[PDB]
Amino acid sequence: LEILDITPCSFGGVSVITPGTNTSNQVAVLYQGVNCTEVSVAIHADQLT
Amino acid sequence: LPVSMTKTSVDCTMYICGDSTECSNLLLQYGSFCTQLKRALTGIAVEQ
Numbered sequence: 001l002e003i004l005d006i007t008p009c010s011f012g013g014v015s016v017i018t019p020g021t022n023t024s025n026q027v028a029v030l031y032q033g034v035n036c037t038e039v040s041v042a043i044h045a046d047q048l049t
Numbered sequence: 050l051p052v053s054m055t056k057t058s059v060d061c062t063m064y065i066c067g068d069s070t071e072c073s074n075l076l077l078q079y080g081s082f083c084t085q086l087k088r089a090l091t092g093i094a095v096e097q
């Protein structure tokens with residue numbers, strides 16, 4: 001008999017930054033509109049889709 | 050004079066079939082209908 005909220009799981013967006021593959025192969029990733037101290041613990045739990 | 054509007058990035062699967070594998074599968078039967086929507090929303094953000 002207590003009150004509990006309901007929230008989105010982590011719904012956001014993934015954008016990938018990259019130079020031309022004719023130049024290099026390194027990549028840096030974005031995580032749209034999410035505090036990524038939350039994904040840093042998430043990769044530890046490997047719960048990232 | 051307005052110069053820009055709020056940029057939107059709606060997503061097909063997450064909007065239509067919230068975390069439902071069967072729903073996403075039946076959405077795949079609709080072809081690339083909504084990739085057009087994603088591209089158009091990227092476009093509107095770019096023009097803003």
Ligand SMILES: *[C@@H]1O[C@H](CO)[C@@H](O)[C@H](O)[C@H]1NC(C)=O
Pocket residue numbers: 035036037038
């Ligand atoms: C998001 O930013 C940091 C990093 O997580 C932290 O202060 C908190 O989680 C959030 N802060 C605000 C103001 O939403």
